[PDB]
C-alpha cells in the first residue's frame, strides 16, 4: 500500500529524495514540498545519493611532495594525485611520492630500503604469506589452527 | 553585467618583474576559481596558473613554475599575476580566466613584451 | 601532460555547409565516477578572448547557436557546425579539461568559401 525507492530516504513518514552526487541538503522535504539541494562549491565535492548540508574539501596534489594531478576536482569526485615519471604512489591513497618499490602480494620484505639499495623482496615460502603491497611489511605465517577449512596462498591467510 | 578587466601589462626588460590584475565586477568572484592563460603573438592557447575558490589551491603550468605566483584577494575583488625573472617566452597577451569546472567568462586581454 | 592534436589545422567551408573539427587526446578525458569526458570547445576570433562553445564534450554553452554540436568519447572528439555562417571565421580550440596542467589544441583555422 506504500513504497520507498533506492534514490530516496525516509525521514517524518514521508519518503524524500536524496541530493544527487554534487548537491547538498538546504532543507528536508515535507509532505507537499520536495527535498531542495545545492551544488557543491567550485573546490567542494560530495559522492554519493545523500543528505548532507556541507561537502567536502577537495584534494590537494602537492608538488613538493612530488604530486601531479591524475585526474581534475568535479562536483561529483576529489582530485586523484600520482607521481612524477620515476616515482611511486606510497600507498592507493597517494598521500606523497618515493623512489623505492614496494613488493607485492606473494613477495615480502627481506630487507627495507637504504642508501641506494631498494627494498630487497623475497617470495613468500610454506607457510607464509602477503595480502597486501609495501614496502616495510614482511611474510608473517598462517594461523595453525584446528579446522582447516581452506589452505592458503602465497597470498592469503588460512580460513579456518 | 559580467565583467574582467586585466591591467598591468607593457614592456619590461629580460630578468625585470611584472604584476598583472584582474578587475572582477558583477558576479561573486569568491565562488570561482581563477586562472592565466597566455597567447604567444601568431601562437596558440597555454594555459600556464590556477588558485582554487575555496582552500586557494594553486597550480602551475611547469613553464611558469618558480617565477610566477599566482594570488587572489576576494575583499579586493581581484586576481593577480607576479612574473618574475622575465624571458623573452613570456611576451604574450595575457588572459584572465574564471572557472566553475570550465573556463566561461575571459577577461580583456593585456599585452605583455619583455623586451631590450 | 596530455596533447590534444587537432585535426585539420586549416579548413575552408563553403556558406551553409557544414564544419567538421576533429581533436584527438593522447590520454582518456573520462571521468569514471560521473562518466563525463572533460572536453571543451573554444572560438577565438580576431583579437578578442576565445569565447566558451561546448564543455563536457556536448553541453553546449548557454547562448551559442545550435548549429555548434559537440560530440565524441574516449580520446577521439569532434566540433560540427552545421549551416555554417559568415560569423563564423574564427579559429577553434580544443581543450583537455581533465587534469593539470589543462592543455589546448593547436588550433584550426577556419575560412568561409564565398
Known amino acids: 500500500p506504500t513504497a520507498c525507492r533506492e534514490k530516496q530516504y525516509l525521514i517524518n513518514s514521508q519518503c524524500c529524495s536524496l541530493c544527487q552526487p554534487g548537491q547538498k541538503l538546504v532543507s528536508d522535504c515535507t509532505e507537499f514540498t520536495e527535498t531542495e539541494c545545492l551544488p557543491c562549491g567550485e573546490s567542494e565535492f560530495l559522492d554519493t545519493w545523500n543528505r548532507e548540508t556541507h561537502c567536502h574539501q577537495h584534494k590537494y596534489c602537492d608538488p613538493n611532495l612530488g604530486l601531479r594531478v591524475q585526474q581534475k576536482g568535479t562536483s561529483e569526485t576529489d582530485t586523484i594525485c600520482t607521481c612524477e615519471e620515476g616515482w611511486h604512489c606510497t600507498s592507493e591513497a597517494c598521500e606523497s611520492c618515493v623512489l623505492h618499490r614496494s613488493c607485492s602480494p606473494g613477495f615480502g620484505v627481506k630487507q627495507i630500503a637504504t642508501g641506494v639499495s631498494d627494498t630487497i623482496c623475497e617470495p613468500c615460502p610454506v607457510g607464509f604469506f602477503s595480502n597486501v603491497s609495501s614496502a616495510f611489511e614482511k611474510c608473517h605465517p598462517w594461523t595453525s589452527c584446528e579446522t582447516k577449512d581452506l589452505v592458503v596462498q602465497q597470498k592469503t591467510d588460512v580460513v579456518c | 553585467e559580467v565583467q574582467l578587466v586585466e591591467s598591468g601589462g607593457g614592456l619590461v626588460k629580460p630578468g625585470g618583474s611584472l604584476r598583472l590584475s584582474c578587475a572582477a565586477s558583477?558576479?561573486?568572484?569568491?565562488?570561482?576559481?581563477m586562472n592565466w592563460v597566455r597567447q604567444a603573438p601568431g601562437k596558440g592557447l597555454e594555459w600556464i596558473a590556477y588558485?582554487?575558490?575555496?582552500?586557494?589551491?594553486?597550480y602551475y603550468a611547469d613553464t611558469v613554475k618558480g617565477r610566477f605566483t599566482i594570488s587572489r584577494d576576494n575583499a579586493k575583488n581581484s586576481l593577480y599575476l607576479q612574473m618574475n625573472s622575465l624571458r623573452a617566452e613570456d611576451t604574450a597577451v595575457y588572459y584572465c580566466a574564471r572557472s566553475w569546472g570550465y573556463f566561461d567568462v575571459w577577461g580583456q586581454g593585456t599585452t605583455v613584451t619583455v623586451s631590450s | 601532460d596530455i596533447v590534444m592534436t587537432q585535426s585539420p589545422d586549416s579548413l575552408a567551408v563553403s556558406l551553409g555547409e557544414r564544419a567538421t573539427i576533429n581533436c584527438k587526446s593522447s590520454?582518456?578525458?573520462?571521468?569514471?565516477?560521473?562518466?563525463?569526458?572533460?572536453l571543451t570547445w573554444f572560438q577565438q576570433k580576431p583579437g578578442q578572448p576565445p569565447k566558451l562553445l561546448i564543455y563536457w564534450a556536448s553541453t553546449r554553452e548557454s547562448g551559442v547557436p545550435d548549429r555548434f554540436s559537440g560530440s565524441g568519447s574516449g580520446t577521439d572528439f569532434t566540433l560540427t557546425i552545421s549551416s555554417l555562417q559568415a560569423e563564423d571565421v574564427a579559429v577553434y580550440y580544443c581543450?583537455?579539461?581533465?587534469?593539470?596542467?589543462?592543455?589546448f589544441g593547436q588550433g584550426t583555422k577556419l575560412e568561409i568559401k564565398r
Open positions: 558583477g558576479f561573486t568572484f569568491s565562488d570561482y576559481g
Open positions: 588558485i582554487s575558490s575555496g582552500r586557494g589551491n594553486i
Open positions: 581543450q583537455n579539461d581533465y587534469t593539470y596542467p589543462l592543455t
Open positions: 590520454q582518456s578525458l573520462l571521468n569514471r565516477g560521473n562518466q563525463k569526458n572533460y
